[PDB]
Design a protein around this ligand. Structure first.
Ligand SMILES: CCCCCCCCCCCCCCCCCC(=O)OC[C@H](COP(=O)([O-])OCC(O)COP(=O)([O-])OC[C@@H](COC(=O)CCCCCCCCCCCCCCCCC)OC(=O)CCCCCCCCCCCCCCCCC)OC(=O)CCCCCCCCCCCCCCCCC
Ligand SMILES: CCCCCCCCCCCCCCCCCC(=O)OC[C@H](COP(=O)([O-])OCC(O)COP(=O)([O-])OC[C@@H](COC(=O)CCCCCCCCCCCCCCCCC)OC(=O)CCCCCCCCCCCCCCCCC)OC(=O)CCCCCCCCCCCCCCCCC
Ligand SMILES: CCCCCCCCCCCCCCCCCC(=O)OC[C@H](COP(=O)([O-])OCC(O)COP(=O)([O-])OC[C@@H](COC(=O)CCCCCCCCCCCCCCCCC)OC(=O)CCCCCCCCCCCCCCCCC)OC(=O)CCCCCCCCCCCCCCCCC
Ligand code: HEA
Ligand code: HEA
Ligand SMILES: CCCCC/C=C\C/C=C/C/C=C\C/C=C\CCCC(=O)O[C@H](COC(=O)CCCCCCCCCCCCCCCCC)COP(=O)(O)OCCN
Ligand SMILES: CCCCCC/C=C\CCCCCCCCCC(=O)O[C@H](COC(=O)CCCCCCCCCCCCCCC)COP(=O)(O)OC[C@@H](O)CO
Ligand SMILES: CCCCCCCCCCO[C@@H]1O[C@H](CO)[C@@H](O[C@H]2O[C@H](CO)[C@@H](O)[C@H](O)[C@H]2O)[C@H](O)[C@H]1O
Ligand SMILES: CCCCCCCCCCO[C@@H]1O[C@H](CO)[C@@H](O[C@H]2O[C@H](CO)[C@@H](O)[C@H](O)[C@H]2O)[C@H](O)[C@H]1O
Ligand SMILES: C[C@H](CCC(=O)O)[C@H]1CC[C@H]2[C@@H]3[C@H](O)C[C@@H]4C[C@H](O)CC[C@]4(C)[C@H]3C[C@H](O)[C@]12C
Ligand SMILES: CCCCCCCCCCCCCCCCCCCC
Ligand SMILES: [Zn+2]
Lengths: 56, 258, 44, 72, 227, 40, 513, 91, 75
């Protein structure tokens, strides 16, 4: 393999105001949206599960 | 700023981590009592997504953005040491459980250790092979460390590959020994102490092996310098911790407890 | 981010009467919860 | 040096693993399972397991792990 | 038993409970004195307009306020441990009685000679006889000989309980799979009450203990009558 | 400590309203539950 | 912007603020639970008619007060706000991991409130002893939800301890030794070391309870050769350190408040105070079995645990006398925070002394599992932690908010609370000496007078809590903006103004050697 | 056998700035404790700043546990209010 | 015989092993005596001690397990 660290340093130091978790580009936004959707949706489902289990 | 410390970009991973904890625990609840794995499989997935993105961002902040000054690296050194201490005290509780049960075997056991009807594994067979494997991996990871410090890319990769191979060998041997064992987790306090203590150790071997594989790919991608490679040091310290816990299990449970 | 008195908090203090409503609901919901938990357990 | 730790890896550590691998290899082969005795401190069931029929351990081996009622 | 508006311990029924009373008086004097001295010194520090705000040297005074507390702790520890070892000393019992805790009642076994055993349940409030004590009376009392060293052995057939009789200075946890020993000696005839002293579920409040202390001859005839 | 006078002074009447509303937010819901215990 | 700031924080001040809001909300839940306890006991007979619900209320009261009120306020709230400011650090070592310590607590709290809502709750006591907490006597999800609540609170505080130790060791000005850090910073470092070592042992024990309940292990089940008493050792190996964890940051805040309102530049005997906190922390690991004097342990073991427990009075005495020596010669300012601190010194001393009574195993036989123990810990822990929290809250509110409290209202609040807690807890000594068990829903008739007075006291503290909410409202409603603070030369946390900017110490302090 | 980058080749951002300044004996990110002068009005302690004020902590005597904190402003030397040691801002 | 005397092998609050040891000793002795067809009366001391100390449910459970072949002690 070849050392491509300098090209990743240029990408992550680009003066575009993006936070580090989104600075890789469009793929970061997708994986973020998948993660937060599963967390928030999962959490709403856990509250439904509590509602169900709170009664006999 | 005219200090050397890292002001971290606002991050969603602490929240996704906290919610993954909620989904894993409520999921285990739903699996043990309401016959369903759905919540648990969502929690495990979000937990793996959180860990991936969080440690990805740490690599972005250090290798790619240069935020790991000597002061920041010194902090991560303390954080990893303190994390390892907390894991030692966790194992201490299981060792206490083991010594408590085995030093004063109750009448239900036949008043002896090992209990009546327990046929322990021979400590000189696969458990001794496992000891040789983890000790060997402590030597190979040390070779990997010195190769990296000396600027030797090929030997660092070969040594670290050997170390991971031994971690996998240990894990496959242990899986095999679990399957072959004539006793189970339900075989009283002997099975309870054996499987829970070696089981948490097994999990730590898988976590440590995963950490080493992360270091292997980062090395392939040239992330580490001959002087700056804290992810490698942290994985090596964790790996020595896993070795040392094994030595204590081998002497206590496998040998003294047989 | 806004700095200074009334700006370093996740709730507004721009209107003392809306703030009273929000503080009422916040502390009130916490104090009420155990009474409604007991009611729940008694009604099963 | 890396040179010394490589010397130890190939000269001592892996030869040890090879010797213990030989030792394990030679002492393998299935030993005879003991007479089933329904001891009350073994095959504990206070709650069904959350998988299978509730009565099988997670890495149940029919050859060497009896159920509470005996070998399958 | 306790009486209304009681401040201190139930009157001692056993010599060891007498010892604990005298030890508590000694300890409580020390607690009163230290409490009072701290409140007085607070009030002394807070009642002058005179000031001294420069750096104060601490080492002379820190000797006083480590050594004096060390001596006070030794003066508590010495009689404390004398009593601990006195309770533990070999007494040769005349009788062994077992109690088993259950949700939510005590059973008693007297198996030195015959197989005598019975259940002991709280009298419901609605069934108390005039003059009887709410939450304290049982149907079947633990009849025991007065003025005799008795070995009590305590266990459980379910969850943790704890077998307590405050006026005898007794509290022994009732643990399944374990046989805990204590000794009981009453100086007097009478009725001595206690209450389950380990949270054991929804009727923890309602599984009391009643000892009935009588002459040996009466204990023997009661025992025979209970077979 | 020193401080400015209140930018939005809370008169005695305003304080009686805030104190009353605060106390009621604690007392009414718990009171409703305890009053209805028999019914539960 | 709101989500980035309050859900995605990497800022020690905003995370401190999240912890204070969480802990205040938790305090309302824990107070309601406490009032239900005292309502059941306020007259003879049954109020709830369901003692499983009484036991659930008692259990939840303790978990909420300990895990969701005291630890988040003292460590998460004051610790995150003050520690970086007091050492001139720009933030915590792990500012993103810090946010996860915070966000683990709402889910932990949700699992506890789920435990109480499913089946018949966990009516176990906060000790969660098997076999009562086992899958026979507590069948169903309630105890497992309680275990998982503790797991998440445990991870929160372990990662928090790693953060505080790293920050305090690594992020001081290079000229500043550990012996030039303020006592509050010492108190948080020592508390963090106790959490780091103690919580993993709790985690191991409650994990064993989980596996006994769900995977047919028998750690605590005699039928498999287990032992209920092993659970008790693992729990209290954690639980004694935990009670020092609950008071140490309070000791730290009391040192600062007494120093400040005495008009002193420094507490009396700084190195003695450091010595005392480290000694308490160490001895705190070797005394746990004083929670087990009635389980049937050997006489020599009881003699050791009695002796080792009494030793803690020596360093603790050094602190109490050092606080009085700090007042000595002070220009005393009778602020509401000083009143809280003086109430702390007195009430902590009373509770500490009843702990020395309990350390005597012989006397503990008769006092164990009685209201004497409840009286001891509501003095030393309940009033101690709460008085230090209220002192620190009234002292630093203007730093955190940029606004002043009404001092007259805050003095009224103190006076009501002082009356209420003493009326509540002092009579519980008489109930314990005279033999009233703890964890009871009802009592023999003789115990009526003290239970009646205790329950009437509980309503007085309720009035104080309601007034406290009004007082905080009045401060934000009126907006009196802070101008000057005295003694900034020995109170660095004030020197960046009220409130300090989002980013402080971007340019670090200059300290030469 | 080579192929591992050095800090000189691959360090970036603030890590690199700290690396390059240290080679020159310079400390722009405040990693080292400054050495006191005699602290007289003639020989004041020189306090670098990127702004017109900076907080000074004064440990007046060796092993004092109490640090004395104050803002040092651009202009005339100021004195520690405890020991009178002189400090002068050099923006 | 009034009750089981103090036994210096078991001097502590936990008397579980005292009950267990005397139960084992009785049944070992009864087997050794029945086997040669000697007299079980030599075993009487062990019998009186375990009957005094042992909970009825423990003896009952141990007796059932000896008859089942699941008693885990050596007799
Ligand atoms: C389990 C989870 C545990 C957590 C593990 C933490 C790892 C943190 C590493 C990280 O996030 O960095 C990736 C990250 C990806 O790149 P980047 O920062 O995203 O983007 C630009 C970079 O600067 C890129 O620069 P670079 O120098 O890093 O190059 C990386 C990459 C650049 O590619 C990109 O990142 C963007 C390209 C566009 C396409 C995006 C594809 C990636 C999708 C990710 C999906 C992951 C989800 C994980 C959760 C699964 C849920 C079930 O180039 C490639 O050609 C590789 C492809 C992506 C690498 C990661 C692939 C993930 C595989 C699954 C492992 C997770 C489990 O690269 C780094 O920063 C380091 C890379 C090297 C580390 C990879 C190590 C993986 C090891 C997996 C362990 C499996 C264990 C087996 C068990 C055996 C036990 C006995
Ligand atoms: C069992 C669970 C455990 C419970 C734990 C509870 C404790 C949690 C602690 C954390 C507090 C929450 C903060 C994080 C985010 C909250 C989300 C939100 O909307 O908040 C609105 C709310 C204030 O709303 P605001 O005035 O309209 O918004 C002003 C923004 O600047 C304007 O922003 P914007 O206009 O751009 O957008 C704001 C907008 C929408 O903003 C967003 O886009 C956010 C959307 C996602 C938010 C999710 C966060 C959930 C919070 C975690 C709890 C679970 O907000 C809304 O007005 C609508 C959303 C309503 C959501 C309500 C959730 C609030 C907390 C719930 C309390 C507990 C309830 C449990 C019920 C149990 C009953 C049995 O924030 C709070 O919840 C604060 C509590 C209420 C005020 C109490 C003040 C007491 C003072 C005590 C003094 C102690 C401090 C001393 C030092 C002070 C100086 C430093
Ligand atoms: C803000 C204010 C809110 C209200 C506070 C709560 C109100 C409680 C009212 C208690 C009144 C008692 C009563 O009816 O007195 C009748 C009672 C009748 O006398 P007696 O029947 O001859 O009883 C003497 C005992 O037999 C003497 O022997 P004993 O065995 O009967 O004595 C044991 C008894 C002995 O305790 C007492 O005599 C009570 C001490 C009260 C201190 C205030 O209990 C204790 O051990 C108490 C433990 C306390 C822990 C340490 C407390 C440190 C105190 C702080 C010192 C600062 C001074 C200010 O008169 C008193 O002695 C007054 C008390
Ligand atoms: C803030 C929390 C906190 C603190 C700091 C303490 C401090 C102490 N505690 Fe307490 N304790 C609890 C919280 C706390 N405790 C809780 C929650 C429980 C019960 C848990 C449960 O069952 O739910 C408990 C239970 C508990 C027990 C078990 C009782 C039983 O269940 O039977 C004992 C036994 O020794 C004990 C003792 C002590 C002692 C000796 C100290 C010492 O550290 C006190 C030292 C202080 C002083 C002594 C006062 C100041 C000193 C002087 C003025 C110097 C001079 C003094 C002398 C010479 C004596 N406590
Ligand atoms: C910190 C710990 C703590 C606190 C504060 C309290 C507070 C109170 N507790 Fe207790 N309690 C325990 C810990 C605590 N408790 C524990 C561990 C048990 C044992 C449980 C078991 O047996 O398993 C227990 C048990 C217990 C019992 C015994 C139950 C039984 O044995 O059956 C009783 C009886 O009266 C009692 C009452 C009260 C009362 C009336 C209050 C209060 O009402 C007293 C007044 C205090 C307040 C009202 C607090 C206000 C604080 C806030 C609102 C926060 C504000 C926040 C900011 C400013 C940022 N509690
Ligand atoms: C090669 C070793 C690798 C280990 C990975 C294997 C499986 C799952 C994960 C293991 C994690 C470790 C320990 C958890 C407890 C039990 C598992 C012990 C190890 C194991 O795998 O034990 C098996 C039983 O597994 C069982 O019950 C399986 C039960 C599965 C459910 C797990 C329950 C989760 C518990 C929650 C963890 C709490 C975490 C606390 C965090 C601390 C925070 C402060 C043994 O099989 P057997 O058929 O009984 O005997 C063999 C007979 N031929
Ligand atoms: C598949 C099985 C599922 C089970 C769940 C857990 C599974 C797997 C987890 C595997 C752990 C992987 C951790 C990868 C961390 C990568 C980030 C990293 O290593 O980051 C490094 C910093 O270290 C750091 O943060 C150090 C951060 C270290 C944290 C790791 C600790 C182990 C985590 C244990 C987690 C759960 C344990 C629970 C058991 C009860 C970056 O600095 P450098 O390396 O100096 O580089 C910079 C140079 O390039 C400059 O020249
Ligand atoms: C990204 C957002 C987050 C995603 C949330 C998704 C929520 C949807 C989950 C579907 O719900 C499932 O329904 C099944 C029934 O249809 C249940 O089966 C289980 O319950 C059945 C009920 O009888 C039983 O047969 C068995 O336990 C078992 O099959 C199962 O438990 C439950 O999970
Ligand atoms: C521990 C915390 C609790 C402290 C004590 C609370 C103090 C009481 C506050 C008032 O609470 C209310 O009291 C009313 C009665 O006074 C109730 O009305 C009830 O009774 C009225 C009079 O009979 C009826 O008109 C209403 O319909 C009926 O709901 C009402 O529901 C309830 O909210
Ligand atoms: C040819 C390549 C060079 C990589 C590079 O310098 O970019 C070499 C260097 C070290 C090699 C690795 C190590 O020699 C160890 C392993 C040896 C096995 O025979 C193949 C896989 C194995 C994991 C190798 C993969 C790959 O061929 C590597 C990575
Ligand atoms: C920074 C270390 C200072 C050590 C002082 C030791 C004095 C206290 C002794 C008891 C606790 C020691 C544990 C470390
Ligand atoms: Zn100076």
């Amino acid at each position: 393999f070849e050392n491509r660290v300098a090209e990743k340093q240029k990408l992550f130091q680009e003066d575009n105001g993006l936070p580090v978790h989104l600075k890789g580009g469009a793929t970061d936004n997708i994986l973020y949206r998948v993660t937060m959707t599963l967390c928030l949706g999962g959490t709403l489902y856990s509250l439904y599960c509590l509602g169900w289990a709170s009664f006999p | 700023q005219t200090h050397a410390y890292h002001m971290v970009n606002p991050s969603p991973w602490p929240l996704t981590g906290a919610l993954s904890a909620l989904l894993m625990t409520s999921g285990l609840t739903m699996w043990f009592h309401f016959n369903s794995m759905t919540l648990l499989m969502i929690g495990l997935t979000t937990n793996m997504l959180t860990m991936y993105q969080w440690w990805r961002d740490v690599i972005r902040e250090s290798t790619f953005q240069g935020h790991h000054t000597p002061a920041v690296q010194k902090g991560l050194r303390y954080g990893m040491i303190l994390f390892i201490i907390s894991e030692v005290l966790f194992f201490t509780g299981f060792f206490w459980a083991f010594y408590h049960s085995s030093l004063a075997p109750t009448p239900e056991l036949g008043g002896c250790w090992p209990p009546t009807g327990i046929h322990p594994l021979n400590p000189l067979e696969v458990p001794l092979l496992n000891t040789s494997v983890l000790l060997a991996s402590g030597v190979s990871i040390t070779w990997a460390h010195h190769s990296l410090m000396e600027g030797d890319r090929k030997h660092m990769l070969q040594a670290l590959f050997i170390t991971i191979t031994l971690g996998v060998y240990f894990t496959l041997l242990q899986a095999s020994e679990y399957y072959e064992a004539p006793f189970t987790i339900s075989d009283g306090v002997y099975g309870s102490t054996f499987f829970v203590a070696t089981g948490f150790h097994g999990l730590h071997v898988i976590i440590g092996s995963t950490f080493l594989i992360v270091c292997f790919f980062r090395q392939l991608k040239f992330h580490f310098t001959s002087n700056h490679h804290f992810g490698f040091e942290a994985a090596a310290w964790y790996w020595h911790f896993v070795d040392v816990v094994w030595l204590f299990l081998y002497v206590s449970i496998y040998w003294w407890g047989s | 981010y806004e700095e200074g008195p009334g700006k370093n908090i996740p709730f507004s203090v721009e209107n003392k009467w809306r703030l009273l409503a929000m503080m009422t609901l916040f502390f009130g919901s916490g104090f009420a919860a155990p009474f409604f938990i007991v009611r729940h357990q008694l009604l099963k | 040096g890396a040179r010394t730790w490589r010397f130890l890896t190939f000269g001592l550590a892996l030869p040890s693993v090879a010797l213990c691998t030989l030792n394990s290899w030679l002492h393998s082969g299935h030993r005879e399972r003991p007479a089933f005795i329904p001891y009350h401190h073994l095959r504990i069931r206070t709650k069904p397991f959350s998988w299978g029929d509730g009565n099988h351990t997670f890495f149940h081996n029919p050859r060497v792990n009896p159920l509470p009622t005996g070998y399958e | 038993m306790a009486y209304p508006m009681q401040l201190g311990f139930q009157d001692a029924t056993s010599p060891i409970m007498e010892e604990l009373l005298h030890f508590h008086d000694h300890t409580l004097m020390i607690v009163f004195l230290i409490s009072s001295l701290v409140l007085y010194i607070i009030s002394l520090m807070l009642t002058t307009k005179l000031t001294h705000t420069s750096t104060m040297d601490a080492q002379e005074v820190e000797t006083i306020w480590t050594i004096l507390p060390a001596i006070i702790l030794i003066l508590i520890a010495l009689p404390s441990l004398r009593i601990l070892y006195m309770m533990d000393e070999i007494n040769n019992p005349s009788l062994t009685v077992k109690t088993m805790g259950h949700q939510w009642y005590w059973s008693y076994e007297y198996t030195d000679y015959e197989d005598l055993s019975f259940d002991s349940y709280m009298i419901p409030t609605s069934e108390l006889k005039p003059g009887e004590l709410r939450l304290l009376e049982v149907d079947n009392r633990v009849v025991l000989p007065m003025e005799m060293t008795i070995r009590m052995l305590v266990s459980s057939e379910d969850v943790l309980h704890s077998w307590a009789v405050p006026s005898l200075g007794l509290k022994t946890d009732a643990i399944p799979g374990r046989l805990n020993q204590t000794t009981l000696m009453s100086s007097r005839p009478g009725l001595y009450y206690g209450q389950c002293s380990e949270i054991c579920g929804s009727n923890h409040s309602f599984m009391p203990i009643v000892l009935e202390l009588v002459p040996l001859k009466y204990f023997e005839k009661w025992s025979a009558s209970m077979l | 400590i020193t401080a400015k006078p209140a930018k939005t002074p809370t008169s005695p009447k305003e304080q009686a309203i805030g104190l009353s509303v605060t106390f009621l937010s604690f007392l009414l819901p718990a009171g409703w539950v305890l009053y209805h215990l028999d019914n539960y | 912007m709101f989500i980035n700031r309050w859900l995605f924080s990497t800022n020690h001040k905003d995370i401190g603020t999240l912890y204070l809001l969480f802990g205040a909300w938790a305090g309302m839940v824990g107070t309601a639970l406490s009032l239900l306890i005292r309502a059941e006991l306020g007259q003879p007979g049954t109020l709830l008619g369901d003692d499983q619900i009484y036991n659930v209320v008692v259990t939840a009261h303790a978990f909420v007060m300990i895990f969701f009120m005291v630890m988040p306020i003292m460590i998460g709230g004051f610790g995150n706000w003050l520690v970086p400011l007091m050492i001139g650090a720009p933030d915590m070592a792990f500012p993103r991991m810090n946010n996860m310590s915070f966000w683990l607590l709402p889910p932990s709290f949700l699992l506890l409130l789920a435990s109480s809502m499913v089946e018949a709750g966990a009516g176990t006591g906060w000790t969660v002893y098997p076999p009562l907490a086992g899958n026979l006597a507590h069948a169903g999800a309630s105890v497992d939800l309680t275990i998982f609540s503790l797991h998440l609170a445990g991870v929160s505080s372990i990662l928090g301890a790693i953060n505080f130790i790293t920050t305090i060791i690594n992020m001081k000005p290079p000229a500043m030794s550990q012996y030039q850090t303020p006592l509050f910073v010492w108190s948080v470092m020592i508390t963090a070391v106790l959490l780091l070592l103690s919580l993993p042992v709790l985690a191991a024990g409650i994990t064993m309870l989980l596996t006994d309940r769900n995977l047919n292990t028998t750690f605590f089940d005699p039928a498999g050769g287990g032992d209920p008493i092993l659970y008790q050792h693992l729990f209290w190996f954690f639980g004694h350190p935990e009670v020092y964890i609950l008071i140490l940051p309070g000791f730290g805040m009391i040192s600062h408040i007494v120093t400040y309102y005495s008009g002193k530049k420094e507490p009396f005997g700084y190195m003695g105070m450091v010595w005392a906190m480290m000694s308490i922390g160490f001895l705190g690991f070797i005394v746990w079995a004083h929670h087990m004097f009635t389980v049937g342990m050997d006489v020599d073991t009881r003699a050791y645990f009695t002796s080792a427990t009494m030793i803690i009075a020596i360093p603790t005495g050094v602190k109490v006398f050092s606080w009085l020596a700090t007042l000595h010669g002070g220009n005393i300012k009778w602020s509401p925070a000083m009143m809280w601190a003086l109430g702390f010194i007195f009430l902590f001393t009373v509770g500490g002394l009843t702990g020395i009574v309990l350390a005597n195993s012989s006397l503990d036989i008769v006092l164990h599992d009685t209201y004497y123990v409840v009286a001891h810990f509501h003095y030393v822990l309940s009033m101690g932690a709460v008085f230090a929290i209220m002192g620190g809250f009234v002292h630093w509110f203007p730093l955190f908010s940029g606004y002043t409290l009404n001092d007259t209202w805050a003095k009224i609040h103190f006076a009501i609370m002082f009356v209420g807690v003493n009326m509540t807890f002092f009579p519980q000594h008489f109930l314990g000496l005279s033999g009233m068990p703890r964890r009871y829903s009802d009592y023999p008739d003789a115990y009526t007078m003290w239970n009646t007075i205790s329950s009437m006291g509980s309503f007085i503290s309720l009035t104080a809590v309601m007034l406290m909410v009004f007082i905080i409202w009045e401060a934000f409603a009126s907006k009196r903006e802070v101008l000057t603070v005295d003694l900034t030369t020995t109170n660095l946390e004030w020197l960046n103004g009220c409130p300090p900017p989002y980013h402080t110490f971007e340019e670090p302090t200059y300290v030469n050697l | 056998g080579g192929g591992v980058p050095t800090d000189e080749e691959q360090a970036t951002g603030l890590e690199r700035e700290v690396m390059l300044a240290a080679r020159k004996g310079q400390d722009p990110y405040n990693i080292l404790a400054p050495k006191a002068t005699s602290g007289t009005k003639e020989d004041p302690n020189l306090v670098p700043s990127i702004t017109n004020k900076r907080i000074v902590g004064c440990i007046c005597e060796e092993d004092n546990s109490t640090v004395i904190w104050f803002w040092l402003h651009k202009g005339e030397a100021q004195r520690c209010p405890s020991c009178g040691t002189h400090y002068k801002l050099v923006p | 015989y009034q009750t089981a005397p103090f036994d210096s092998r078991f001097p502590n609050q936990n008397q579980t092993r005292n009950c267990w040891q005397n139960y084992l000793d009785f049944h070992r002795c009864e087997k050794a005596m029945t086997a040669k067809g000697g007299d079980v009366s030599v075993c009487e001391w062990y019998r009186r001690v375990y009957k005094s100390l042992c909970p009825i449910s423990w003896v009952s459970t141990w007796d059932d397990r000896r008859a089942e072949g699941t008693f885990p002690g050596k007799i």
